[PDB]
Structures are given as C-alpha cells and as structure tokens.
Amino acid sequence: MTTRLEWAKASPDAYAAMLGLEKALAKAGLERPLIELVYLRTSQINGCAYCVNMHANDARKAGETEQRLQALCVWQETPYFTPRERAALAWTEQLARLSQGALPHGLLDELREHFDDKEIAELTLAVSAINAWNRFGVGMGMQP
Template sequence: MNNRINWAQKSPEAYKAMLGLETALSKSGLDHSLLELIRLRASQLNGCAYCVNMHANDARKAGETEARLQTLSVWEETEFFTEKEKVVLAWVESLTLLPVHRAPQHQYEALLKHYSEAEVVNITLAVATINAWNRFGVGFAMMPS
C-alpha cells in the first residue's frame, strides 16, 4: 500500500507544470504511437510500475502490437522496429541513462538523418518529460490500479 504523499494534490502547480509539458508534446506533431514507445521505454528503464502500466495500455490504444510491446525492452534484438524508431529508442536510452551513455554524437547524427531539428527537439522533450513523470511515480511509490 502506498503511504507516500499525493504529490499532485499537495502541489497543484507542480502538476500543472507537468501538464504544460504534455500540452506542448500534444502539439509537437510527433506520432502518438512513437510518443508512447518513448514513454514506455523510459519508464521501463526507470522502474516506474505506474507509468509502465499506463503507457503499455496507451500504446495499445495507439495501435501498437503485442509483439512490439512485449519486446520493447529488447528492441535491438528484434526486427519489429524500423530504423527510424530504433534511432529514437537509442536516444531514449542514452538520455534516460545519461550518466552512463552521455548522448553520443553518433546517435544525435542518426536522429538528424530521419527527423528534422524541430522533431529532434520534441523527441528530446518527450524523453525529458517522461523521465520527470517517472521521478514523481517512483519517488511517491505510485502503483498501477
């Protein structure tokens, strides 16, 4: 049972700020399914049970297949993801595990082969945003219902 504070209730301004990031992402033009893959992969890496559950469900609603969802944690070992998606997933992992991977130049250049500079900014915003949500989810022991 979760006995930690309800952060959104205790700091509505913090919650409102996070929703502002989501509003920006909804206007970014990025594909909804890609956004859910970004959110789900980062949440897996961060161990946020609440977010993994929510974004797996949201990805299904966005049209993701069970095969892709079941193998997202081992995306490099499958043929289920396009090259364009793989460069994003590599970026997600590097930015989520920043102290380990540091955002390598070759990954940045790979992104620019498939996405515009504005899209790269918005992909990075998506990674930063889900990592922030994950800190609230893990930090306040949020559980899926």
C-alpha cells in the same frame, strides 16, 4: 493508482507545470505511437511501474501490436522497428541513463538521418517529460 504522497494535492503548481509538458507534446508534429514507445521504454528503464502500466495500456488502445509491446525492452535485436523508431529508442536509452556517462557524439547525427530538427526537439521533450513523470512516479511511491 496507489501512492505514498499525493503530490498534485500538495503542489497544484507542480502538477500544472508537468501537464504543460504534455500539453506541448499533444501539439507536437511527432507521431503519438513513437512517443508512446519512448514513454514506455523510459518507464521500464527507470523502474516506474505506474507509468509502464499506463503507457503500455495507451499504446495498446491506439493499436500497438502485442509483438512490439513485448519486444520493446529488447528492441535492438528485433526486426519489429523502423530505422526512425530505432534511432529514437537509442536516443531514449542513452538519455534515460544519463547519470551513467557521456552520450555518444554520433547519436544526434543518426537522429537527423531520420528526423528534422523540430522533431528532434519534440523527441527530446518527450524523453525529458517521461523522465520527469518517472521521478514523481517512483519517488512518491506510486503503484499501478
């Protein structure tokens, strides 16, 4: 990492609070490989190069396949993802671009074809946290 402002040095509290997001999802029932896809697809949408690099590397270390890794930015028209992963990425895409308009009503319905309500909160936790990391990532000018 290179950065324009060492935000964990300047505010240990903020850094500790953000780790708390990670600590809660580390405990989550939701699969780590799904979460990695959510982190990776979100960081791509948000243009956070540090987080893209980080989370591609982690998904790959856990053996994520180069085929799914390269195709994730265009997942909709690929045969590579399960209906469960696809519902979670639809959620991810829409919630990454929340500034752009209303979220479709039936999206949460589609999720619950594939996930229980606890998984959905954990999923939304993951979206929420990466969107948070990306904002420090890009705002503080961090680079891989």
